[PDB]
Amino acid sequence: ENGNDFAALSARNLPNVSVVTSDNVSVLDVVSANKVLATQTALTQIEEVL
Amino acid sequence: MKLHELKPAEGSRQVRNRVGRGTSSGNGKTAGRGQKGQKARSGGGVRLGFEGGQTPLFRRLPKRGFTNINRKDYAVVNLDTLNRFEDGTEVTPVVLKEAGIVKNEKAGIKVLADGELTKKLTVKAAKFSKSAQEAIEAAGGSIEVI
Amino acid sequence: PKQKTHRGLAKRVKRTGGGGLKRGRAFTSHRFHGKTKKQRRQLRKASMVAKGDYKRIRQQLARM
RNA sequence: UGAAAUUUUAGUACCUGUGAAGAUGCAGGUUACCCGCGACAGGACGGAAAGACCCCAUGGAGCUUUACUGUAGUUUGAUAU
RNA sequence: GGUGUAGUGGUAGGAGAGCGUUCUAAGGGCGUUGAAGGUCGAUCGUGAGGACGGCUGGAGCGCUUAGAAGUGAGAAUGCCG
RNA sequence: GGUAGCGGAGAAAUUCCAAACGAACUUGGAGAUAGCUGGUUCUCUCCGAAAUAGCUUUAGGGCUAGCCUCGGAAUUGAGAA
RNA sequence: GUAGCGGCGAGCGAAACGGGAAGAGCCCAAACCAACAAGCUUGUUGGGGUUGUAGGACUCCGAUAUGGUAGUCUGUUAGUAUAGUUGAAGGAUUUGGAAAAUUCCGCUAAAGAGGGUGAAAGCCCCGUAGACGAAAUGCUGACAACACCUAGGAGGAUCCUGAGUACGGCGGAACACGAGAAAUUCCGUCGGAAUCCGCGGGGACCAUCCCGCAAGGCUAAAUACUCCCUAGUGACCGAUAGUGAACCAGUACCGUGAGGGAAAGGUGAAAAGCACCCCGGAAGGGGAGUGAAAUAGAUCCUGAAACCGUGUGCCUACAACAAGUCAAAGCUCGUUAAUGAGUGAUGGCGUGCCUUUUGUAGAAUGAACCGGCGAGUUACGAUUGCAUGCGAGGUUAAGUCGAAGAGACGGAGCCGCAGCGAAAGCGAGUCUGAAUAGGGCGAAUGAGUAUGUAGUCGUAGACCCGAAACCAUGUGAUCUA
Ligand SMILES: [K+]
Ligand SMILES: [K+]
Ligand SMILES: [K+]
Ligand SMILES: [K+]
Ligand SMILES: [K+]
Ligand SMILES: [K+]
Ligand SMILES: [K+]
Ligand SMILES: [K+]
Ligand SMILES: [K+]
Ligand SMILES: [K+]
Ligand SMILES: [K+]
Ligand SMILES: [K+]
Ligand SMILES: [K+]
Ligand SMILES: [K+]
Ligand SMILES: [K+]
Ligand SMILES: [K+]
Ligand SMILES: [K+]
Ligand SMILES: [K+]
Ligand SMILES: [K+]
Ligand SMILES: [K+]
Ligand SMILES: [K+]
Ligand SMILES: [K+]
Ligand SMILES: [K+]
Ligand SMILES: [K+]
Ligand SMILES: [K+]
Ligand SMILES: [K+]
Ligand SMILES: [K+]
Ligand SMILES: [K+]
Ligand SMILES: [K+]
Ligand SMILES: [Mg+2]
Ligand SMILES: [Mg+2]
Ligand SMILES: [Mg+2]
Ligand SMILES: [Mg+2]
Ligand SMILES: [Mg+2]
Ligand SMILES: [Mg+2]
Ligand SMILES: [Mg+2]
Ligand SMILES: [Mg+2]
Ligand SMILES: [Mg+2]
Ligand SMILES: [Mg+2]
Ligand SMILES: [Mg+2]
Ligand SMILES: [Mg+2]
Ligand SMILES: [Mg+2]
Ligand SMILES: [Mg+2]
Ligand SMILES: [Mg+2]
Ligand SMILES: [Mg+2]
Ligand SMILES: [Mg+2]
Ligand SMILES: [Mg+2]
Ligand SMILES: [Mg+2]
Ligand SMILES: [Mg+2]
Ligand SMILES: [Mg+2]
Ligand SMILES: [Mg+2]
Ligand SMILES: [Mg+2]
Ligand SMILES: [Mg+2]
Ligand SMILES: [Mg+2]
Ligand SMILES: [Mg+2]
Ligand SMILES: [Mg+2]
Ligand SMILES: [Mg+2]
Ligand SMILES: [Mg+2]
Ligand SMILES: [Mg+2]
Ligand SMILES: [Mg+2]
Ligand SMILES: [Mg+2]
Ligand SMILES: [Mg+2]
Ligand SMILES: [Mg+2]
Ligand SMILES: [Mg+2]
Ligand SMILES: [Mg+2]
Ligand SMILES: [Mg+2]
Ligand SMILES: [Mg+2]
Ligand SMILES: [Mg+2]
Ligand SMILES: [Mg+2]
Ligand SMILES: [Mg+2]
């Protein structure tokens, strides 16, 4: 979800991790990723967006 | 899908045909243009409708008519489309635009009697055909010329 | 750029409901003493662009 | 000491015939051991120059005139100064 | 997949299906225990073409799926060497 | 030293104007235009012409039709012998 | 690509409305007032005033405020540009000349961007994430200061409101509009107004109506462009490519001059660039050395083909040969081990490739050979096929936010759902017609649309190369007249 800066920063540098905000998610990102780790608030915001 | 296993739908994409790439391809050498002539030249060919000097068809035919400056066209609506509304509903150009039936009303809505109306309605429009007015009123509705 | 319309044709033909082109008739300008009344009566009526002519010119009226 | 034009690859004969109708190369026959050197110029429709002759292109250019259309100049009138 | 019958010369040209080249993405790999490239070989496929060995070489390159093209030369009195 | 290309100069030859002057040279418009000539690069499979009519400042060009190819619709099956 | 313009040809081609980006409005001239000066007006100065629901002067009243600015090398302040500082984490084992590679255990990460290092490094180096930093000089923004603008109401008796102007004739030109029925705008020439009961415009012109107030000026933002500077990006080039120019390139060279205009990158990790010896006058070699490698020795990575030469397994001096192919003895050799390979006496058949042609072995054209380079592309539109989504519906464009992304919003607009008629107009009909007739085009009898992709077409150089030429700037009388 927006504003989770510490989570975003701490995760980004991992080679296998791609960080995206729930508001900015694209077909290419989802398809590239083998698994999707989402927070519950992020899922709520996604459901609202779609 | 997986980026390493993509597959387009069958027949969705085709391979471009490249000419002048050897004889066995069927477009080698002449590249399908044939042998000499005007149509075989780069940028060759005659302008559209040209007839090699025979008087073209449009020249043979006479001009006709004129355009009325005050021309008025009406967005047409038929009784079958009016059936989509409920009895007692007030049909209005705004109602039609909101319903998406008439995106562009032009000079105004004119109602025509193509189909069979079945609902009682009060219809407001720029114009009504005589048959359309009769059908609306016979269905127990009413018509008002906005 | 946008493909341009042939203005001469646009003045001389009309697009019909079925996609065809309605056209006037030739020989309807003058020298009527050289034509029988039957010819004049039957040239007064409009006609349609023939298949061959249409296939030559359709691209000039695409957006008429 | 050391070029050049040319050059599809060539183990590159003669006669008669054939063939896009004038063949070293195709047919029949004849002649001819292999490689050169000095000479000649019949042929390779030899080389050189996308024939200048001829015709064609709704090509070009220079020129002519009572070709067409313009026009610099020259002249005549009105008008302003 | 099997059987049967029929068919399969071809210029202009239409249709179809493929080979190979460079690059991008993803996946999965290979490389100083020798990549690409070069060279030789008596190898495989119906074709464009694909492997595998020996030698040379010395650092990058395949494969599968999809994508994009400066994507294939033997001729232009083509240009450069 | 002077005369400069819509030009100069010419005891006059279309003669000279930096080794080609019926209009210098250089750059630009400019990749002028070329119904004309040449060239146009991998493979296999299916089918496969035309060199005719009509009209054309048209005749070695072009347009429609005829002949080829690919897809589709439909029929009281209309084609061929 | 509509309305239109157009030898009504070829073509040319709007504007308003609507949706957005950005937004900002202000000064004079004149009337009139005060002063000044000369010669009751007439010039200078200051005030005054600025306009169309007419304004202003002028006359009455009342307020001496209220707000604003597109000003200032005026400071004060902040930020920023131009140097910088800091910045985590690895050792072993195998191959190797060299480890970053391999293998085993670790560690770091707000840093796994990137580059370099003796081969391919998150942890070796420069860096990166992040944190921090400016004496001096610019730039920006704020704050303040100074500065400059900033009045309401009521009356019209009178005065002012842009003159050789607007406008007209003639001749041109600009408006998509080529004189056309032609408005509107402008130029030259001539003629030549009104002024608020006024004037201009609403595409000849007139009347009515509506809208506006010319002949004076200024004005930021959205917009166009990049020689340069800084930081980056690329399904862009990789030494015949990419700038002409990766290299001392606009150089060499060419030309009187304008001007034209090249070629030319790579030793190795490190010069460790071969001490010394030998042949030779040297050049150049052979040893000896360096090096992992010298057939990496400076013409230096790799090192193809043409071309040239050395060695030889087979064949060749009675043969007429598009040079091969088919058959084949002999000899030689033994492979991706295949009913093998090289050569080949001898015999059969057999006139190259390409282009262009009715027809070419052609004595028709092109190629000396080898290598490289060298020709249907892209953008915007049209149309068809195929594919996907939605479906009587389909869809957004510009623009805003966002990584130069996707995506979201944006429905203005476009296509389709109704046609017929020249048009008024009518409408599942409509037009022709006197017609309930006939007939035409339509409906009955419905699929479209957005996007992708491919075929073809149009506009563009439009598949590539090629004129003689035309036009517009320049450079040339050092030859020659
Ligand atoms: K074709
Ligand atoms: K007509
Ligand atoms: K006539
Ligand atoms: K011949
Ligand atoms: K001779
Ligand atoms: K000449
Ligand atoms: K090999
Ligand atoms: K060549
Ligand atoms: K002379
Ligand atoms: K348009
Ligand atoms: K014309
Ligand atoms: K004032
Ligand atoms: K190091
Ligand atoms: K590194
Ligand atoms: K500063
Ligand atoms: K006019
Ligand atoms: K108006
Ligand atoms: K107005
Ligand atoms: K080497
Ligand atoms: K030999
Ligand atoms: K033989
Ligand atoms: K000849
Ligand atoms: K009727
Ligand atoms: K009818
Ligand atoms: K569809
Ligand atoms: K399409
Ligand atoms: K082009
Ligand atoms: K094209
Ligand atoms: K002289
Ligand atoms: Mg494509
Ligand atoms: Mg063919
Ligand atoms: Mg060829
Ligand atoms: Mg040809
Ligand atoms: Mg042809
Ligand atoms: Mg008439
Ligand atoms: Mg007759
Ligand atoms: Mg004969
Ligand atoms: Mg003979
Ligand atoms: Mg022979
Ligand atoms: Mg010969
Ligand atoms: Mg000759
Ligand atoms: Mg000739
Ligand atoms: Mg057969
Ligand atoms: Mg490569
Ligand atoms: Mg190419
Ligand atoms: Mg060559
Ligand atoms: Mg003479
Ligand atoms: Mg001379
Ligand atoms: Mg031009
Ligand atoms: Mg056949
Ligand atoms: Mg004619
Ligand atoms: Mg021909
Ligand atoms: Mg560090
Ligand atoms: Mg390690
Ligand atoms: Mg004009
Ligand atoms: Mg005038
Ligand atoms: Mg006027
Ligand atoms: Mg008004
Ligand atoms: Mg501005
Ligand atoms: Mg270069
Ligand atoms: Mg190279
Ligand atoms: Mg160059
Ligand atoms: Mg070597
Ligand atoms: Mg070398
Ligand atoms: Mg004998
Ligand atoms: Mg013998
Ligand atoms: Mg002939
Ligand atoms: Mg030749
Ligand atoms: Mg001079
Ligand atoms: Mg001189």
Question: What residues contact residue B66 under an 8 Å CB cut-off, 6+ apart?
Answer: none
- What value does the CA radius of gyration of chain A take, rounded to a whole number of Å? 11
What is the CB neighbour count within 10 angstroms for residue B102?
19
The single residue listed with the structure tokens 């701490």 is: A10
CATH number at residue B104: 3.100.10.10
Could you please report the per-residue DSSP string of A2-21? TT-HHHHHHHHTSTT-----
Residues of B in contact with A31 (CB under 8 A): 1-3
The single residue listed with the structure tokens 């791609």 is: A18
Contact of C24 with B62, CB cutoff 8 Å: yes
Range of the domain at B112: 75-145
- The pair of structure tokens assigned to A41 is 């608030």
Experimental method: cryo-EM
Nucleotides of G under 7 A from a protein CB: 1-6, 8-13, 109-113, 129, 355-357, 375-377, 379-383, 385-388, 392-395, 402-403, 405-408, 413-429, 440-443, 446, 452-459, 461-465
The answer to whether the Cβ–Cβ distance between C23 and B59 falls below 8 Å is no
Contact of C49 with C21, CB cutoff 8 Å: yes
The answer to whether the Cβ–Cβ distance between B60 and C26 falls below 8 Å is yes
Cα of A6 to nearest chain B Cα, Å:
30
Resolution in units of Å: 2.9
